Amino acid sequence: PQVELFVKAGSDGAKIGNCPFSQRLFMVLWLKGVTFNVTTVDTKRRTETVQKLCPGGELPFLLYGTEVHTDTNKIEEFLEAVLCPPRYPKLAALNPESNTAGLDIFAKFSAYIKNSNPALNDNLEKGLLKALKVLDNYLTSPLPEGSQRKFLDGNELTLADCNLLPKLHIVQVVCKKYRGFTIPEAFRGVHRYLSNAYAREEFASTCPDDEEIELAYEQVAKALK
Structure with missing residues (x-):
């Protein structure tokens, strides 16, 4: 199922910004070898879809198919559990x-x-x-x-x-x-x-x-x- 990670945008509203939680999840997804995409979010000018997907403004957040996942720790737990062998390696x-x-x-x-x-x-x-x-x-x-x-x-x-x-x-x-x-x-x-x-x-x-x-x-x- 399609995987999309939403991370904070940096200084110009577009680059990936400083955030150890975003980077943690990026690393986990890369190490898993899963196909995914990333989307940056300028906390001072968020888009309509984002304003709707994540009303509370928590970042980072993840979309797995059509379901939104929040809380970095819970997102990591979810990814370790569902992206598992033999297709994807256990990272624990x-x-x-x-x-x-x-x-x-x-x-x-x-x-x-x-x-x-x-x-x-x-x-x-x-x-x-x-x-x-x-x-x-x-x-x-x-x-x-x-x-x-x-x-x-x-x-x-x-x-x-x-x-x-x-x-x-x-x-x-x-x-x-x-x-x-x-x-x-x-x-x-x-x-x-x-x-x-x-x-x-x-x-x-x-x-x-x-x-x-x-x-x-x-x-x-x-x-x-």
Whole structure:
């Protein structure tokens, strides 16, 4: 059945905009190998059909045949269940820990980048570094089930990566631009993971361009005074 994903539009009302939820679903659909289409939505000038398909304005959203699906988590669950073998590969992680590792980074980043007071930056930057180190330890330690492995759960991209990678990419782009902050080179696990991810088109190609991510954070990110 025809699959159509509706995602937020970026700065010019047309390009794909910054949104880790949209990118997560794009990655899942690409990894499944299903035929699908994508439609961008300018939250300041939505179309009639969209105004009707999704009255509440939640984005992203998905159309499966003629049925609308909302809530990124529920949409992902649905896709894993219905796009299944032998036609399409199972993307779920085997190690439960893969599904939480590094998830806390994004919130820590968000608090860190919204803060402008230098006294508080010392603490938030350290909390961000700490969360990055915990992820690094997960990536360097062998997994119970299934280190030098490429991704969170092994050598194949799973649903866990589809959630985390978009978020980490935003962290990197925004932190570098607005704070000159880079993920420590000391964190080899995190760096190898990001390099391995960037080599995969499913991630690289679904990243909005840096300026779009930067501009998405213009009224969020503050300079430290």
